[PDB]
Design a protein around this ligand. Structure first.
Ligand SMILES: [Mg+2]
Ligand SMILES: [Mg+2]
Ligand SMILES: [Mg+2]
Ligand SMILES: [Mg+2]
Ligand SMILES: [Mg+2]
Ligand SMILES: [Mg+2]
Ligand SMILES: [Mg+2]
Ligand SMILES: [Mg+2]
Ligand SMILES: [Mg+2]
Ligand SMILES: [Mg+2]
Ligand SMILES: [Mg+2]
Ligand SMILES: [Mg+2]
Ligand SMILES: [Mg+2]
Ligand SMILES: [Mg+2]
Ligand SMILES: [Mg+2]
Ligand SMILES: [Mg+2]
Ligand SMILES: [Mg+2]
Ligand SMILES: [Mg+2]
Ligand SMILES: [Mg+2]
Ligand SMILES: [Mg+2]
Ligand SMILES: [Mg+2]
Lengths: 129, 224, 88
RNA sequence: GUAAAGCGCACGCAGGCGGUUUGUUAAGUCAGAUGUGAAAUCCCCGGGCUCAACCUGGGAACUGCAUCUGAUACUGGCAAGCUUGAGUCUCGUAGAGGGGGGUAGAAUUCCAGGUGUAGCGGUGAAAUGCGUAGAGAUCUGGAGGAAUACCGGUGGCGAAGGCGGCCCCCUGGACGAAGACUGACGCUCAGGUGCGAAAGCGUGGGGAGCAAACAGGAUUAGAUACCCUGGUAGUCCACGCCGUAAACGAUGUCGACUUGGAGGUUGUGCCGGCGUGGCUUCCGGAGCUAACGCGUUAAGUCGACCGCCUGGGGAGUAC
């Protein structure tokens, strides 16, 4: 059964990018929307939108730069079988700072750099590069 | 070149849907009586862009190799090339013609080494056996390397007809970095192709239309 | 399996309506009816293993529904198991 | 997958994991602080022995623990929901799914008789064997057991093992179309439990054909074989046991996602055409792979949980 919607969303992005899809759609959730907001404001996806009243669907517009997918790698880190939390001193750098780690802090879901600037740790959702 | 003449020449008739290369999907329009219709509303800018990139290439000391051996093209692709002082290959592409130019160049060296003997008379000196042999060597090197005798070297563009049939010539172009302009049908891959003209590449009228357009464009480029 | 009439009768008795075919009490009562009925079949056909797999599936589903009901509403659970004569 | 390695298959307790929304909590988590974390040691900065080793002053560090005060995104608890996962109902559909009973036709063998007469049978060739006490062949009648030609199909059904004439009785699952209903009731599963080809074992039946063992005839240097002529367990039935197979896709289960082509089978919608579901065969793209290959039924891209491996032999043996 489906037991990690976030890994599912990351996999949908990864597979759609590999397949050169212009967009991917998945069932929505507020956590997925927060992650997509981080992805969009960091430049990894073009845009996202949610449609539907009782069964919301989240659609992500993927982006490509020069025939290449922009999301080079996208990887789940904390997962249901093994949760990963980091204090602010031990927040991971992704690709020596050229990528991002998406962190759920008590002030919301943000990049590792934003969490570092806010002086917070949290759950390491995924690495995007 | 504008839409109506493409319908007249049947540019929009592709192959049967079962022989399609899924990567042609973006130029496909429908599947009529189970055959694929090409979206000519893209054959145009695409083609018109191909015709401008050629010009830019020609108009600048340009060397355009036409490529079309499919027997419903050989004759057709010679004259279009012949009409613009360009080179052609309309009888089987010899594996290596480009990548193996240093060897192939020696056989054209043989074509002139021997053609210039069909006139100098040298044959008036054989046991009728060896001269009627050197002639088979002529009509043979004339059949394949006949249209690239004057190329005197590698080209600045290929204008291939049927990226599927001419897959060897394109991989060679790609390997050497010479741009490829080609008619890719609904059964062919446009991957190694630099200018894709989605369109029919086995109807005589469509191939004649493309060849005429390219030859006129190259003549304009050289004249300017 | 249960006939249309026996199924509809159980649905009317245990359901909160004749349309309420999905409530846990209705599902458990239908399963209990079929299990009790099949006791006679398997008393005669002891080597009918293939059918007995379906019977054991009925038993397992009923156990799961009863556990769900007990965790969800213990009073409904108690009423149900008293009406149907189930140990637990 | 083939190098060592997916339990034969399944159900399922403990356990691990858990769709979506709101509130609440603040356990996990995170932030700050306080106490503590001996000194030495390590590390950084200095200082002393001519240098160094050594000695030594301050720091850092001791990633820990406890407490207090905050944060509330995620995870957990609690409360209320929701319907998309899971399930119930209604109507139909295909099927060698299972259990029980009955029955049909073909054939083999045996028994009785008729006709008939010198061979039959068998092999590479023979011989053993059968036959004038009348075989073999052919006809009639009877007995009995086992299996169901054709249909029949990289067809179907089943969790796997498996399942094939026809008819009835009892019974399990799957699938499709419209809805209605329940409202996360789910997934996986150590231990446990159940099922589990063939052979084998126990008791009682049955025994046509076939056939381990066994006997004879050949072959051969030998021939405890392959070939031949016979032939008993067994193969069949009931009930119990055994629990293993190259039990194989040598590929654990569940869910999601990701270009195509040609078929098979089984539903269903609309007008032979166009859709839309289930199962399934072959080819192949990206990707993957040591390669072979796999390729939407993945060996691709991911998540949950379990099983299992760690050079060859000794050994799946000894105790
Ligand atoms: Mg092996
Ligand atoms: Mg192995
Ligand atoms: Mg297996
Ligand atoms: Mg299970
Ligand atoms: Mg949850
Ligand atoms: Mg706390
Ligand atoms: Mg200390
Ligand atoms: Mg000093
Ligand atoms: Mg010190
Ligand atoms: Mg909560
Ligand atoms: Mg076990
Ligand atoms: Mg047996
Ligand atoms: Mg026995
Ligand atoms: Mg016998
Ligand atoms: Mg024998
Ligand atoms: Mg075994
Ligand atoms: Mg088998
Ligand atoms: Mg098999
Ligand atoms: Mg195995
Ligand atoms: Mg394949
Ligand atoms: Mg042993």
């Amino acid at each position: 059964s489906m037991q990690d919607p976030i890994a599912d969303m990351l996999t949908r992005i990864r597979n759609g990018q590999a397949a050169n899809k212009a967009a991917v759609t998945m069932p929505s959730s507020k956590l997925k929307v927060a992650i997509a907001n981080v992805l969009k404001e960091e430049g990894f996806i073009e845009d996202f939108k949610v449609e539907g009243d009782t069964k919301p669907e989240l659609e992500l517009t993927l982006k490509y730069f020069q025939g290449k997918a922009v999301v080079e790698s996208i990887q789940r880190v904390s997962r249901p079988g093994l949760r990963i939390y980091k204090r602010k001193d031990e927040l991971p750098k992704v690709m020596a700072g050229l990528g991002i780690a998406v962190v759920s802090t008590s002030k919301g879901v943000m990049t590792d750099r934003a969490a570092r600037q806010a002086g917070l740790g949290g759950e390491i959702i995924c690495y995007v590069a | 070149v504008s839409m109506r003449d493409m319908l007249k020449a049947g540019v929009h008739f592709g192959h049967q849907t079962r022989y399609w290369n899924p990567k042609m999907k973006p130029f496909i329009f429908g599947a009529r009586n189970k055959v694929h219709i090409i979206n000519l509303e893209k054959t145009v800018p695409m083609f018109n862009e191909a015709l401008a990139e050629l010009n830019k290439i020609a108009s600048r000391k340009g060397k355009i190799l036409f490529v079309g051996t499919k027997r419903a093209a050989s004759e057709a692709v010679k004259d279009a090339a012949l009409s613009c002082d360009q080179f052609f290959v309309n009888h089987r592409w010899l594996g290596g013609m480009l990548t193996n130019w240093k060897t192939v160049r020696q056989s054209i060296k043989r074509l002139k080494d021997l053609e210039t003997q069909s006139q100098d008379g040298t044959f008036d000196k054989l046991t009728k056996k060896e001269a009627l042999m050197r002639t088979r060597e002529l009509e043979k090197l004339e059949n394949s390397l006949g249209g690239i005798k004057d190329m005197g070297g590698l080209p600045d563009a290929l204008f291939v007809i049927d990226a599927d049939h001419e897959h060897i010539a394109i991989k060679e172009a790609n390997n050497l970095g010479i741009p490829v302009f080609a008619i890719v049908d609904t059964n062919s891959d446009p991957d190694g192709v630099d200018f894709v003209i989605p369109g029919n590449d086995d109807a005589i009228r469509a191939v004649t239309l493309y060849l005429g357009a390219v030859a006129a464009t190259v003549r304009e480029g050289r004249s300017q | 399996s249960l006939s249309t009439e026996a199924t509809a009768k159980i649905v009317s008795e245990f359901g909160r309506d004749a349309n309420d075919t999905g409530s846990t009490e209705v599902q458990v009562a239908l399963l209990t009816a079929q299990i009790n009925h099949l006791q006679g079949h398997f008393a005669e056909h002891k080597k009918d293993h293939h059918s007995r797999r379906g019977l054991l599936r009925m038993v397992s589903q009923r156990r799961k529904l009863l556990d769900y009901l007990k965790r969800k509403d213990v009073a409904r659970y108690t009423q149900l198991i008293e009406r149907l004569g189930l140990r637990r």
